[PDB]
Amino acid sequence: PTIYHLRKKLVDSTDKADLRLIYLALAHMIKFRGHFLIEGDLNPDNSDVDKLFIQLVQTYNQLFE
DNA sequence: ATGAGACGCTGGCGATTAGCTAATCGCCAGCGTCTCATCTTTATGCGCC
Secondary structure, eight states: OOHHHHHHHHHHOOSOOOHHHHHHHHHHHHHTOOOOOSOSOOOOOSOSHHHHHHHHHHHHHHHOO
């Protein structure tokens, strides 16, 4: 129904899909790339505020007694 | 040694037939961001030919 279904499908599955669909996904990504405001790369960690915030509190507690 | 010259309802209707700018007012107008640097310039504050 959307392009993101094909996106998620091609991202997860490692099966040989049609070349036109692969082209559509890649060209759609290029046509709407995103901002370059954040330097480096954000590898998908916990992806939740809770876990990383707990880690933050852990670092703050071990840093300052 | 005879046989030409002298020429109409229109105007006033209807009724087709055909064709055209203009005056009044309302609507409604591509726009969204960020980064980066870059220079200026201003308010105040300090010096005598």
